[PDB]
């Protein structure tokens, strides 16, 4: 299988602030009403984060494009989504993403998830496209178009539909599915968090914590990754997914990580409620020097 799309209308990306998001529990240790200092990979506050809003805009030839370039992985990636109709499905993490090295794949199917490390032969423009059309009976259909061949599938794991599904009550457009991916010592750790919002698109200034979800013992090398978009096939033309189609206005944000020292405040139950970045500014340096969120007058010593 392989499909080409023309869709070469280009445009530069856009930048925003991370403000104060991107804090996750570093260990399985529980504490109560204490302040803890730690050193680990994090997202520095008020950062330089990319925003990939590059697809067709609702109008006359409104800059149609496929929004999925490959990006470097480095040490850690923070992935943020604001999307309601389930346009993004999964991801591919690898080094050469070819028929010469292994590559981990994550894909959701509106039910329990599919996870595997294997050796696939990805297409030029990876995607999976589905459509609901009554052909033999009304309202079914799953599809598959991601790759052409797959050899040496050395692991399999089907547990749950991820926290992407299973919304609660009231609320509704949560649209803050935040994920952090780490690869340490042959272990692929994934964190997740969901939080309701009240705005069409912006990162709110509130504070939230990210829980550990899974730690897969894979042990493969990742240097680049790519997202997977659930293409919608408007099956009114004989050119299938290689022809005219229409979808929404999905977009996402990607941020990177660097080693930092952070101060964390645990409440009386064991949930992080406020963090302080050590390397921000003189106030932050002083507040990291002595364990306190408030400081009195005088003159203090720093690095």
């Amino acid at each position: 299988q392989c499909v080409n799309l023309t869709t070469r209308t280009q445009l530069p990306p856009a930048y925003t602030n991370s403000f104060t998001r991107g804090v996750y529990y570093p260990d399985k240790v529980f504490r109560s009403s204490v302040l803890h200092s730690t050193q680990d990979l994090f997202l520095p506050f008020f950062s330089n984060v990319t925003w990939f809003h590059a697809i067709h805009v609702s109008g006359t030839n409104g800059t149609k494009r496929f929004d999925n370039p490959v990006l470097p992985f480095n040490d850690g990636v923070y992935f943020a989504s604001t999307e309601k109709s389930n346009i993004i499905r999964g991801w591919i993490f690898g080094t050469t993403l070819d028929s010469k090295t292994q590559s981990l794949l994550i894909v959701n199917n509106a039910t329990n998830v599919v996870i595997k490390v294997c050796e696939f032969q990805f297409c030029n423009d990876p995607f999976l496209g589905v459509y609901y059309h009554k052909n033999n009976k009304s309202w079914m259909e799953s599809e598959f178009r991601v790759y052409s061949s797959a050899n040496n599938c050395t692991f399999e794991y089907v547990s749950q539909p991820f926290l992407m599904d299973l919304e609660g009550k009231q609320g509704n457009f949560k649209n803050l599915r935040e994920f952090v991916f780490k690869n340490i010592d042959g272990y692929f750790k994934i964190y997740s968090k969901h939080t309701p919002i009240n705005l069409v698109r912006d990162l709110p200034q509130g504070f939230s914590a990210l829980e550990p979800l899974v730690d897969l013992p894979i042990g493969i090398n990742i240097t680049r990754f790519q997202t997977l978009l659930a293409l919608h096939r408007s099956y009114l033309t004989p050119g299938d997914s290689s022809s005219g189609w229409t979808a929404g206005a999905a977009a996402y944000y990607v941020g990177y990580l660097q080693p930092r020292t952070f101060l964390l405040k645990y409440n009386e139950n064991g949930t992080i409620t406020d963090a302080v970045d050590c390397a921000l500014d003189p106030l932050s340096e002083t507040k990291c020097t002595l364990k306190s969120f408030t400081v009195e007058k005088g003159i203090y010593q720093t690095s």
């Epitope: 309601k84 389930n86 079914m140 457009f173 069409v200 206005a249």
Partner: antibody
């Protein structure tokens, strides 16, 4: 072939109770979710209630809160509504409609419609 | 609830004429609007979802555009089977609320 067999219309005295029912035949009724919408003569369409898929989340209209009971039965693939109304204007035509998401992608828009049942509240 | 303004309430134009229906909301809701078509004496039918997506089995002569709080419903060329009623409806967090509705006609 998707059939929505509906029944339960009629004329009653104010404060009466009725039993609306529509059975879906020809598809996975349990997998998808239904929805309700009513139309007064010469008026637009307004949502009434919802049952989702596993009946885990139930939504009722604010104007008709605590008045209608909605249920479904996958054993014989039907949808029931105990309609208890104390107001005359509820005289209208009802429609049970089907969605397009597998179970619940993101809230409920309409994909299929029935024929509509007539309900009259008058002396 | 968010207010829907539909313009025009009703317009009349001969066949083969571009028809524009403007639906405006009182709150920024991005692309979460749906267009429903109802023929006389018949149950309503869905035409456009996400305010810009054409479904399967819907004639290609119909289209839609717009985003934010303003949306346009476009008929490139009228044909003698498009006489019906059209409705625009948001889809965010409120259970449901339909607009006033627009009925189209032909000047001949």
């Amino acid at each position: 072939e998707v059939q929505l067999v509906e029944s339960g219309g009629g004329l009653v005295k104010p404060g009466g109770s009725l039993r609306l029912s529509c059975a879906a035949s020809g598809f996975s009724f349990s997998s998808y979710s239904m929805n309700w919408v009513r139309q007064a003569p010469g008026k637009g369409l307004e949502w009434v209630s919802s049952i989702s898929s596993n009946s885990n989340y139930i939504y009722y209209a604010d104007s008709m809160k605590g008045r209608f009971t909605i249920s479904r039965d996958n054993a014989k693939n039907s949808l029931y509504l105990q309609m208890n109304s104390l107001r005359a204007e509820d005289t209208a035509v009802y429609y049970c409609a089907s969605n397009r998401s597998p179970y619940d992608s993101s809230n409920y828009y309409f994909d299929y419609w029935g024929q509509g049942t007539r309900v009259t509240i008058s002396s | 609830a968010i207010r829907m303004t539909q313009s025009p309430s009703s317009l009349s134009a001969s066949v083969g004429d571009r028809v524009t229906i403007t639906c405006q909301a009182s709150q920024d809701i991005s692309n979460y609007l749906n267009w429903y078509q109802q023929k006389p004496g018949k149950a309503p039918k869905l035409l456009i979802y996400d305010a810009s997506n054409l479904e399967t089995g819907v004639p290609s002569r119909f289209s839609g555009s717009g985003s934010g709080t303003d949306f346009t419903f476009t008929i490139s060329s009228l044909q003698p089977e498009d006489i019906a009623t059209y409705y625009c409806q948001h889809h965010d967090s409120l259970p449901l609320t339909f607009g006033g509705g627009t009925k189209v006609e032909i000047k001949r």
